[PDB]
Structure 1
Amino acid sequence: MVETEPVQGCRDFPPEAMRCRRHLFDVFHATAKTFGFEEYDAPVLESEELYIRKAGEEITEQMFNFITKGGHRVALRPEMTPSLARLLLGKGRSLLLPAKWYSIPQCWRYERRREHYQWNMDIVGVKSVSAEVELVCAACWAMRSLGLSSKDVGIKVNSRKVLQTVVEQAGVTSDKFAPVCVIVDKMEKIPREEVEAQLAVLGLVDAITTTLSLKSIDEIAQRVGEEHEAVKELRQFFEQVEAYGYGDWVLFDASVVRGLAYYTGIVFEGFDREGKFRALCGGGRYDNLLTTYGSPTPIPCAGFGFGDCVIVELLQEKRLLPDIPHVVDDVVIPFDESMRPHALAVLRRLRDAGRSADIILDKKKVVQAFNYADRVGAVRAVLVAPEEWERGEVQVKMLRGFAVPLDRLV
């Protein structure tokens, strides 16, 4: 007997499970359309080089990589953003800006689950914080579309420029900034003795702790100035999100850095207000990535990723994922095999009119055909019997036996 279980750390999606996933994706798609984002895709298999950033990131530590038979180093994408950048670079001057691109790629890791789907939304060619605002509102919009309120979740928001200044003022060559954000991001999970050790292990702390634990924007105006670009940006951000109507969804948190190397400005993180779950989504501005990839002109970018697992746990906890049973409008039941041809002509017309319809495919008695119709969640059973066919009719019966002329069925 064969191995019925999927490969280590990956999920099967039989119809029941697939309905749950499709309910989630519908929202991701519907939200992108609402916000004017265009869909894209790229291979799940990308060159390994694409992710060699050399900043001790979890995402590049836990790459699911291998060597092709022909020698080339490739990998199953751990994230989409580098793929996006490559596409953007290839377009170059032909790419009209600003561009708003989205996708729902499966992304991978080797280690616990080894794959997840991650909704990606990104805005390209927008200098101002209006990008981050839109993005953050898109994420709130989706969560709200799934049944969640500002009582259930929020989005913590920060800027890396604050810390950039503190690092810069402290004489630290700017090349150390990315490795620092990555360690500081660990602060949540690892202890302060362990996190302090990594910053010292990178050749160096006090000012970092104090600034991470600042609880308000006023307090960072004290420390940095009321027109550090970061203060002006965050105020504009919050004012814009206020104005869009999602003020109760967003708040400031000076400890939020995110784990990725390329964020340069505003960064953000979705969370459940009960403190039970990991981050629901994560994102930020990344204005230098494309310059890093070799763009002859800097290209401002911002975006986020929004996983398919934490959100589902959350929705299951809040009882917002009722099992969605399969449905179909009509189930056509031939009285017996001599009626099959006629049953098919009826099936054809039901479908021609835009309805979803089955026909009983195997041979069985009418009552068992009816039970089957109930089991597949048919809204209506259409019995095709010889007596009624003579009258140009069939027997209809609503499941959620009046005879009906064929033309009136639809």
Structure 2
Amino acid sequence: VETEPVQGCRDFPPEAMRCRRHLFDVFHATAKTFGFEEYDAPVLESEELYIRKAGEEITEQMFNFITKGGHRVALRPEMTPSLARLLLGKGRSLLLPAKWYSIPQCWRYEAITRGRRREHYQWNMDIVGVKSVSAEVELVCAACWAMRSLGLSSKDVGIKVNSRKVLQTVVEQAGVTSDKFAPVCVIVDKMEKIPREEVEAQLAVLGLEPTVVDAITTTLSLKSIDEIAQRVGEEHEAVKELRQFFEQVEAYGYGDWVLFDASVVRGLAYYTGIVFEGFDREGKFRALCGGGRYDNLLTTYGSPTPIPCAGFGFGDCVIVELLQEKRLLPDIPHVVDDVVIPFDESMRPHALAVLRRLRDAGRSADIILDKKKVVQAFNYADRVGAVRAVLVAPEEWERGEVQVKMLFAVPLDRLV
């Protein structure tokens, strides 16, 4: 007798489902406008695929189980690995650069509320085979367009930007093997989420000294690009890469949308370079979206030659919270072009004839299926939001006509 859905999952009845479609049309449209090709993988993947274990939180937050037949498995918590699989699968036949997108469902055994439910759809845009920041620029501009398309602006939403190289330098400059670095990126991401002493505690636990911990704290708090230059020199990849990224987005004309934020690092250990996170200016919700460059990952899965990648994920939850707070998700109710009312059931076969004729003429149309009275029919027309009620009565039908109410006798040739 049980009606509620599993755990923190969402049901999508028509009313809700429309909102989703509205949201998706946009992603697709934006992809197309930006020239991305759609792909998809199976939601269920091999457990083996997600073996990185870089101190992350995603490894245990897994819907994993065993089929017996074939080997053990898990429902995907992110698309990227599944992309990498498909890419590498394509092998020598893979033509580059490639620009691929997808709107896959994703499963994290996570903490339900607020806007981080146990299942979520995630719009992935990825550029593969592009070395320069030209990629990230495009990608970030793609998120913006989408949002702008949804009815947002730079004043509602921002995108914070940074490069992990800045950090990667600082660490490499003190005496710790890149060994412990990715874990530091996991730790350091928590600075937004929790207080400084507990981050600094976990970094001391990873073995690091206090004086190196200090350096990290400082870097994270660095105010601008100009200021980056002074801790690492204007002659430096990270520096000139950001300046290009920023000059290019300003050129494309989304200047107000982005800004530098030294704090941004991301919680996934395969990012190599530039990284970004979409946020609402008021600072109400978790990240709208997040992404960055991941050059080495494809080598990690075993590409005989390393393949640069950048790309982001864009959730379907937080974004909606924001649109609903900005009253940009007005329910647009179901409509249909025509409702065909058989006068009595003897007219039904003629009604059908008429219905076919409209559906052929490319109309969207509906027909009263059970025997019901004339009022009820009109009532139905109103419920389903019909633009027009075509009543098929006999007196008229014999004269080769039907009745039409808009929401007088019309012959068929003048109907459609």
TM-score w.r.t. the length of structure 1 is 0.98
> CA offsets per residue over residues 299-338 of structure 1, 9 Å max, x none?
0000000000000000000000011200110111111101
- How far apart, CA to CA, are the structure 1 residues paired with 2:329 and 2:57? 31
**CA 1:36–1:71 in 2, change beyond 3 Å: closer, same or farther?**
closer
- How far apart, CA to CA, are the structure 1 residues paired with 2:58 and 2:406? 53
> CA offsets per residue over residues 94-142 of structure 1, 9 Å max, x none?
0000000010000002247210000000000000101100100000011
CA contact (8 A) 1:161 1:230 kept: yes
* Deviation, structure 1 residue 161: 0.5
- How far apart, CA to CA, are the structure 2 residues paired with 1:157 and 1:380? 52
* Deviation, structure 1 residue 9: 1.6
- How far apart, CA to CA, are the structure 1 residues paired with 2:264 and 2:37? 29
- How far apart, CA to CA, are the structure 1 residues paired with 2:158 and 2:60? 29
1:339 to 347, 354, 360: 347
- How far apart, CA to CA, are the structure 2 residues paired with 1:155 and 1:390? 66
**Secondary structure, aligned partner of 1:187:** helix
Q: Work out the percentage of aligned pairs sharing the same amino acid.
A: 100
* Deviation, structure 1 residue 89: 0.6
**Secondary structure, aligned partner of 1:61:** coil
* Deviation, structure 1 residue 198: 1.2
- How far apart, CA to CA, are the structure 2 residues paired with 1:286 and 1:409? 59
Q: Are positions 1:404 and 2:410 aligned together?
A: yes
- How far apart, CA to CA, are the structure 1 residues paired with 2:135 and 2:358? 47
- How far apart, CA to CA, are the structure 1 residues paired with 2:263 and 2:251? 25
Q: Are positions 1:238 and 2:246 aligned together?
A: yes
- How far apart, CA to CA, are the structure 1 residues paired with 2:67 and 2:308? 34
- How far apart, CA to CA, are the structure 1 residues paired with 2:295 and 2:60? 23
- Report runs of 4+ in structure 1 exceeding 4 Å deviation: none
- How far apart, CA to CA, are the structure 2 residues paired with 1:176 and 1:63? 24
CA contact (8 A) 1:328 1:356 kept: yes
Is the deviation greater in 63-72 or in 270-279?
A: 63-72
Cα RMSD (Å) of the superposition? Answer: 1.0
Residue of structure 1 equivalent to 2:42: 43
Residue of structure 2 equivalent to 1:277: 285
* Deviation, structure 1 residue 190: 1.8
* Deviation, structure 1 residue 348: 0.3
**Secondary structure, aligned partner of 1:408:** coil
Is the deviation greater in 389-398 or in 319-328?
A: 389-398
CA contact (8 A) 1:117 1:308 kept: yes
**CA 1:71–1:404 in 2, change beyond 3 Å: closer, same or farther?**
closer
* Deviation, structure 1 residue 93: 1.2
* Deviation, structure 1 residue 227: 2.0
- How far apart, CA to CA, are the structure 1 residues paired with 2:377 and 2:371? 9
* Deviation, structure 1 residue 10: 1.3
* Deviation, structure 1 residue 69: 2.8
> CA offsets per residue over residues 14-51 of structure 1, 9 Å max, x none?
11110111110111111111110001011111111111
**Secondary structure, aligned partner of 1:282:** strand
Q: Are positions 1:226 and 2:225 aligned together?
A: no
> CA offsets per residue over residues 188-230 of structure 1, 9 Å max, x none?
1122111111111111011111010011000001111112111
TM-score w.r.t. the length of structure 2 is 0.96
CA contact (8 A) 1:60 1:78 kept: no
* Deviation, structure 1 residue 368: 1.0
Q: Are positions 1:138 and 2:160 aligned together?
A: no
CA contact (8 A) 1:395 1:403 kept: yes
**Secondary structure, aligned partner of 2:217:** helix
* Deviation, structure 1 residue 71: 7.3
CA contact (8 A) 1:133 1:237 kept: yes
- How far apart, CA to CA, are the structure 1 residues paired with 2:68 and 2:319? 38
**Secondary structure, aligned partner of 1:333:** strand
Structure 2 spans left out of the alignment, 5+ residues: 111-115
CA contact (8 A) 1:155 1:268 kept: yes
* Deviation, structure 1 residue 72: 2.2
**Secondary structure, aligned partner of 1:59:** coil
* Deviation, structure 1 residue 73: 2.2
- How far apart, CA to CA, are the structure 1 residues paired with 2:305 and 2:162? 26
- How far apart, CA to CA, are the structure 1 residues paired with 2:192 and 2:328? 28
Q: Are positions 1:325 and 2:324 aligned together?
A: no
> CA offsets per residue over residues 254-273 of structure 1, 9 Å max, x none?
00000000000000000000
Q: Are positions 1:187 and 2:191 aligned together?
A: yes
**Secondary structure, aligned partner of 1:188:** helix
* Deviation, structure 1 residue 175: 2.1
* Deviation, structure 1 residue 61: 2.8
- How far apart, CA to CA, are the structure 1 residues paired with 2:14 and 2:375? 25
* Deviation, structure 1 residue 403: 1.8
- How far apart, CA to CA, are the structure 2 residues paired with 1:405 and 1:130? 60
Residue of structure 1 equivalent to 2:113: none
* Deviation, structure 1 residue 58: 2.0
> CA offsets per residue over residues 157-190 of structure 1, 9 Å max, x none?
0000000100111121112211110100011112
- How far apart, CA to CA, are the structure 2 residues paired with 1:409 and 1:241? 52
- How far apart, CA to CA, are the structure 2 residues paired with 1:137 and 1:397? 48
* Deviation, structure 1 residue 67: 1.7
* Deviation, structure 1 residue 5: 1.1
